[PDB]
Amino acid sequence: FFSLIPSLVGGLISAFK
Numbered sequence: 001f002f003s004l005i006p007s008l009v010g011g012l013i014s015a016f017k
Contacts, residue, residue: 002009
């Protein structure tokens with residue numbers, strides 16, 4: 001239920017591409 005996620009959680013996403 002967090003918000004304004006940091007490049008931290010988003011980082012793992014970029015890896016998935």
